DNA sequence: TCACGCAGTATCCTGT
RNA sequence: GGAUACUGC
């Protein structure tokens, strides 16, 4: 997979979540930790490779007003880590929505999480409204958002964003997501 | 009648014998014409507390501001009337004084008339928050009695006290040759202007051995040095002790090898002989009393040996616990607590001095270990008896003979290293100096000293000083380096005291900053007197120059050269804890505002000389807090000199007491990152010649987590790059050297000393979460699991990196010393040193020079220049 | 019962 | 984000 392509794939098959990092990380070049774990696992999920993802990281932080050799001191042995290369060495799976939902809380400047979760309702149809979702389809996932099954709400999203009436899958992972509009686009 | 007597040490019990202070000290007989011990007994410290009138009569603060005007009577009759009979005070006197304040309770006017209350230490104790209808503050309700004691008798440190009208004693109080009661506090006075008396010392070492089954340590054997006029204002004496005494005890399991009789026979007769440690432990518990030492020195005599001491004592019962101490005790303090306080209790009225704390005040060292301490300090090698063997020593009369007097010489090179630093006479002139206890000074710590200094300042101004306790702001500036080499000389302009002297200049004190209960205060005027702080800082400063004026004399010994140097570090550190106490979150003088401002005028006094500087077109490449480094950019001393005098002289054109002065040239410059760099300091012996003196600040060459292998090749590499030869040759000398250490890790020729990483414990090896991820808690857990002395925090482990087929990370295969040499299936993990110890310190050492790159250096290395 | 301040560099880890 | 070290001023 090519880095340029990420931002393609932003478009469409990304899951909210990984929308907004994503967004946030362009508009600033940096990500608090929470959003650096987040995004670094669900890249290396899509299947951005160990140098993918380095060069990826190193281009889009060099931008922020760093110094070139901090990133290879600070955010490689990172970077390695979730690749499983040091420490246990161990190939940490990717955050699961459970995991998601039920990890680190975010805070103001955070922008990890589940937005359906937490994103205000005002602020999630602010958002719908921004993506040109119909009305009734925004309505529709805030009504979903309004019962606590957010995981329902990512799939009316998938319905509604794919043009399919039915999704078809139990969206239980963000890669699944990712995975799922892959398989209906190419 | 009138007893004039040199006090040492004073011991109070808040709970049991209430207002009773017990200073010990030596009296002069004529008898025996000598010094003996004497133990006072100063009685009825009456309890002081203050009372601060009210502006207006508040009903119990219920209908707020009534109108009445208040006076001093008021305020009496109030505390007469309600206060009294309800906290249950029977007879007490009271005046009125006039007394000052500043410090950090709000709506405490500068100078108010308090009602002064004094009243026996018997009755209860008033409330801190205690608020009637007449006062709005009560001060001194939780004083000590030694505290009291040592203010109201302006007492600062050991000194000479006579004492009017002594009173004998109706029964024995202490274990002293001499005894005298005073009925008041008054009776006490001291004397100036007379010199120390001689004190015995007592230097012991133990060896003992861990039963495992109680897991209790056993002592086995004690050796002491003694002598008996060391003096407290001289130098050691040649020989540091007089007489000698050693006790040997059979373990509860082994016999002696039926011929210890006829060894201890053709030995020596200072050898005691016991079967049962019991026995051992009254024998020298009878030996303490006899001697009556004043100075107790050991090494881990406040962790290790006096506990395990107590520990024996109270479990085979031995009689007579007391005399370990010089106060007579019927129950004994309670085992535990932080640092040794339980210890000093036990060996109350007697000062200890553990060479472990005192070595870590004065000096620095990779390690305080015992071994590590005689090398660097006595530069002698110390034997080290195994802790298995010990037990095993008891199958023959040599190897028995041969422990006794390990232990003997473990005494010997403690006496050594304490006469060496001067630990005592230095503690005396520093407790003198701030008016502490003795026995304080030397169990370590800064914050006492500067409370005590503070206390004795306010109290003899006039002043109620506050009650004892029941990134916080921005600091120096240090600017951007322009990192690089520079072959030529450069000029390093340092402040004098920088702190203290703006702390004297701009009149930062208590009573001059306007505080409000986080914003930098403004300046004071320049229209008021000096304060209490800034006089105390002054007194010294001028101590601190005076000591390096007797440095400059010429044709001076060495070794007391150094013993001046020392002293000089020392008062240093007291004034610039005289300033960071004011930022110490626990401290009885928090003042974090004034601290603020010290560091704020500290920026801004750099700020503006770099601008100097600038203006005089010169160039500035560094400085830290108090410095700049300036780039002479000439190769003429003498110019080079003129150059200093002249900027210092227009630095100093804009201050009063602050003084700037050149604190080195270099010839040559490795500036690699902020506040770590090398230089060749250049001494200038006369007629124009000068030698170069090879100095380092703060690379890993001159850190102890790095292995000492890598710290020499980067000494080496350092050498080269600072000298005068051509850099090609420099380089290809580097490269030569690099491939050398290379082979010398391949064949393992290399001594398995220096693949050691030394490291040291911040808390307890428990207490860290992360027991497999951190190496150096990994060793030390393996330690506490043997069957030797247990590590603890602030004891420093050394440990290698080793492999074993586990296939785990470096830091999950750290592994002692001796682990290595026994294990046959561990062996030195060659590839870790060669590639995280000597290529990083090497490569961040070769970065600004030209020809040196990390690949590079990984080749000469033979690892594989591709990740790299 | 304890314990000086702050600025800065280097190394290493994130499963139940 | 956290943890462990120890230099400087
Ligand atoms: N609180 C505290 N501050 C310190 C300590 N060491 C240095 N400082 C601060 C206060 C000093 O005024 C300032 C300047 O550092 P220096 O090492 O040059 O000492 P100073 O200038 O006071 O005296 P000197 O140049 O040695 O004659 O750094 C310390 O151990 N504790
Ligand atoms: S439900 Fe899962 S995939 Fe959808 S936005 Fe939330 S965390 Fe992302
Ligand atoms: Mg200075
Ligand atoms: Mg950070």
């Known amino acids: ?186 | 009648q009138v007893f004039r007597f040199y006090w040492l040490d004073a011991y109070e019990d808040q709970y049991s014998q209430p207002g009773v202070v017990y200073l010990f000290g030596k009296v002069w007989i004529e008898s025996a014409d000598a010094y003996v011990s004497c133990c006072v007994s100063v009685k009825n410290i009456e309890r002081t507390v203050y009372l601060l009138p009210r502006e207006n009569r508040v009903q119990l603060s219920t209908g707020k501001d009534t109108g009445a005007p208040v006076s001093m009577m008021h305020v009496y009759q109030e505390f007469n009337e309600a206060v009294a009979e309800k906290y249950k005070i029977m007879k007490f006197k009271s005046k009125k004084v006039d007394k000052d304040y500043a410090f950090e309770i709000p709506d405490v006017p500068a100078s108010s008339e308090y009602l002064e209350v004094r009243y026996s230490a018997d009755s209860p104790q008033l409330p801190q928050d205690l608020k009637g209808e007449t006062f709005s503050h009560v001060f001194g309700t939780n004083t000590s009695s030694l505290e009291l004691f040592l203010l109201s008798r302006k007492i600062k440190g050991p000194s000479w006290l006579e004492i009017k009208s002594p009173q004998l004693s109706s029964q024995p109080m202490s274990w002293c040759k001499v005894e005298a009661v005073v009925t008041r506090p008054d009776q006490v006075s001291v004397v100036k202007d007379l010199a120390p008396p001689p004190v015995v010392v007592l230097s012991l070492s133990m060896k003992t051995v861990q039963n495992a089954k109680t897991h209790q340590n056993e002592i086995v054997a004690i050796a002491a040095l003694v002598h008996h006029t060391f003096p407290l204002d001289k130098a050691p004496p040649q020989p540091p002790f007089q007489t000698h005494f050693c006790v040997l005890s059979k373990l509860n399991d082994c016999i002696f090898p039926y011929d210890y009789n006829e060894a201890v026979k053709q030995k020596n007769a200072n050898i005691e002989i016991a079967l049962t440690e019991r026995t051992l432990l009254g024998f020298f518990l009878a030996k303490i009393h006899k001697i009556d030492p004043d100075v107790i020195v050991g090494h881990d005599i406040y962790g290790f040996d006096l506990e395990v001491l107590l520990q024996r004592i109270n479990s085979c019962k031995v009689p007579f616990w007391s005399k370990i101490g010089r106060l007579r005790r019927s129950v004994m303090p309670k085992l535990g607590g932080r640092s040794g306080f339980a210890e000093r209790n036990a060996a109350c009225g007697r000062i200890i001095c553990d060479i472990e704390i005192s070595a870590k005040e004065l000096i620095r060292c990779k390690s305080y270990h015992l071994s590590e301490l005689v090398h660097q300090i006595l530069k002698a090698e110390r034997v080290v008896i195994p802790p298995e063997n010990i037990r095993n020593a008891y199958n023959d009369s040599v190897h028995l003979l041969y422990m006794l007097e390990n232990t003997w010489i473990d005494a010997k090179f403690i006496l050594q290293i304490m006469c060496e630093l001067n630990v005592l006479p230095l503690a005396l002139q520093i407790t003198n100096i701030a008016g502490n206890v003795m026995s304080r000074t030397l169990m370590g710590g800064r914050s006492e000293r500067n409370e005590y200094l503070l206390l004795h300042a306010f109290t003899e101004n006039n002043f109620i000083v506050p009650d004892k306790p029941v990134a916080a702001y921005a600091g120096g500036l240090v600017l951007e380096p322009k990192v690089g080499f520079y072959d030529k000389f450069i000029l390093l302009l340092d402040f004098n005291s920088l702190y203290p002297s703006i702390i004297q200049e701009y009149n930062i004190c208590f009573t001059t900053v306007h505080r409000e209960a986080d914003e930098i205060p403004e300046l004071p005027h320049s229209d008021l007197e000096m304060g209490i702080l800034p006089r105390e800082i002054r007194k010294l400063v001028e101590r601190r120059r005076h000591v390096k004026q007797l440095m400059k004399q010429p044709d001076l010994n060495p070794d007391l050269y150094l013993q001046y140097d020392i002293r000089q570090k020392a008062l240093k550190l007291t004034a610039n804890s005289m300033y960071g106490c004011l930022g110490f979150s626990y401290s009885r003088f928090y003042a974090k505002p004034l601290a603020a401002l010290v560091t704020h005028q500290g920026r801004e006094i750099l700020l503006h000389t770099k601008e100097m500087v600038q203006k005089m077109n010169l160039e500035v490449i560094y400085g830290d807090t108090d410095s700049i480094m300036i780039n002479t950019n000439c190769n003429n001393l003498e110019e080079v000199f003129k150059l200093g005098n002249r900027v210092k002289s227009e630095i100093n054109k804009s201050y009063k007491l602050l003084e700037i002065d050149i604190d080195g040239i270099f010839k040559s410059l490795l500036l690699l990152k902020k506040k770590k760099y090398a230089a060749l300091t250049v001494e200038p012996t006369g007629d124009g010649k000068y030698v170069t003196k090879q100095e380092l600040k703060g690379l890993d060459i001159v850190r102890r987590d790095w292995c000492e292998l890598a710290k020499q090749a980067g000494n080496y590499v350092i050498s080269q790059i600072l000298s005068d030869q051509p850099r090609d040759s420099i380089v290809e000398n580097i490269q030569k050297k690099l491939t050398e250490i290379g082979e010398n890790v391949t064949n393992g020729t290399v001594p398995i000393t220096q693949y050691e990483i030394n490291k040291a414990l911040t808390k307890d090896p428990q207490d860290y979460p992360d027991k497999k991820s951190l190496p150096h808690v990994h060793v030390a857990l393996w330690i506490n699991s043997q069957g030797g002395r247990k590590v603890k925090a602030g004891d420093t482990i050394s440990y290698v990196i080793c492999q074993d087929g586990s296939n785990l990370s470096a830091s999950q295969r750290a592994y002692a010393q001796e682990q290595l040499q026994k294990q046959e299936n561990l062996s030195i993990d060659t590839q870790y040193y060669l590639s995280q110890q000597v290529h990083p310190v090497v490569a961040r050492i070769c970065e600004p020079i030209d020809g040196i790159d990390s690949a590079l250096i990984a080749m000469w290395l033979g690892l594989d220049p591709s990740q790299f």
């Open chain 1, 1 to 186: 997979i090519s880095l340029e392509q990420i931002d393609g794939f932003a478009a469409k098959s990304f899951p909210l979540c990984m929308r907004q990092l994503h967004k946030s990380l362009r508009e600033n070049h940096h990500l608090r930790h929470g959003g650096r774990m987040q995004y670094g696992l669900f890249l290396k999920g899509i299947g951005l490779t160990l140098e993918q993802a380095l060069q990826f990281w190193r281009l889009e932080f060099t931008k922020g007003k760093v110094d070139s050799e901090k990133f290879d001191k600070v955010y490689a042995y990172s970077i390695r880590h979730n690749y499983g290369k040091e420490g246990k060495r161990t190939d940490y799976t990717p955050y699961s929505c459970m995991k998601v939902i039920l990890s680190n809380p975010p805070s103001q400047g955070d922008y990890h999480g589940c937005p359906f979760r937490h994103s205000d309702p005002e602020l999630l149809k602010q958002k719908l409204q921004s993506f040109k979702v119909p009305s009734s389809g925004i309505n529709q996932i805030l009504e979903l958002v309004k019962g606590m099954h957010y995981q329902l709400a990512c799939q009316k999203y998938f319905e509604l964003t794919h043009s399919v009436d039915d999704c078809g899958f139990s969206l239980n992972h963000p890669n699944q997501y990712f995975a799922e509009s892959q398989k209906l686009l190419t």
